[PDB]
Amino acid sequence: QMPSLAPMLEKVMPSVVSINVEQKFMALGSGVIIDADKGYVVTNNHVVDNATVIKVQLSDGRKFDAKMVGKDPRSDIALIQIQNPKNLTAIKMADSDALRVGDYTVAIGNPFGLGETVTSGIVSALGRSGLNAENYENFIQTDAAINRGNAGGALVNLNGELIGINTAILAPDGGNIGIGFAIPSNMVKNLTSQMVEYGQVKRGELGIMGTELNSELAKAMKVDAQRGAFVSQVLPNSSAAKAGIKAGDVITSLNGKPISSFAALRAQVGTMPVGSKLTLGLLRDGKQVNVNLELQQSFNGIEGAEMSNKGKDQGVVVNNVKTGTPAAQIGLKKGDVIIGANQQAVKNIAELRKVLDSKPSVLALNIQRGDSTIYLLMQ
């Protein structure tokens, strides 16, 4: 009585696909089914970017036509949707925060377009980053065989639960040398569930700057931990400024789960939707500090000018004007009052909008600045 992965795999392999996408080029990659009914397939962005035609081939051979749903190249995640799905098999996703270095992994993909290829390995390490200092990267590293074409494929645990999406290998020659990286499933969950609900990735920010924490900085700042996030500075009017996070603080944990590095921490919340409440574990002056937070974004404010109504149907008064804005090109200044536009009088932000809803090629605004009555022009 021998062991084998075949039972687990014959349940999972129908859920991993191969993708064909077409200075004209032809490309090949892999994808994994997220929703059985809607035909959603997750895949790497560098596979279906600049795609005119997207053909998906299932495990049985059935070809399908797919089109784009969402994309986020900062994390190299893209979601496509099979058109007219018939009898599709979704995969079961696991929480990658339960992963541990040494757990056995199985990678599924289409290396060199050969067809679905299954490869085995272990969790080589976790939390790896740095291969593109501006990309959101929190890779699972694995010694499982992964080559050109395995991108967008499935990295699953021994129960078949999806733990990550194979993305890139470290290889001086373009062929696997036992170092493959996969985006953890939890980032795929937060990213794809946004591409469905919003179409793109609603990016939130906390308003803190920081650098990594080395064993050399731990000495100078009387800090105990040797790896984390060092709060250099917090922007005012930011969630952290509001939450009372001061400079020189050190972020040790996130929601209980400790942090491995700033670059991992940056990539985690880079995938969280705006408004995602969370809790952080700080460390200032040798005191353990917990803090709750709320992401934010980076009347009818149009093109960088905040405006509301003035008087009883007396038009729309501009309230602020950011310099170097579309508003600055138009010349409008804070305190300016609109009476009408395009020979139509404006009483409130509704009548303004119904001319903006009419979408004209040029916009002539009948404002009054100070004592004078002038016109402004747009578009």
Binding site: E134, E205, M209, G210, T211, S232, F262, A263, R266
Partner: peptide, 5 residues
């Protein structure tokens, strides 16, 4: 290495 989050 001074990114923003």
């Amino acid at each position: 290495c001074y990114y923003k989050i």
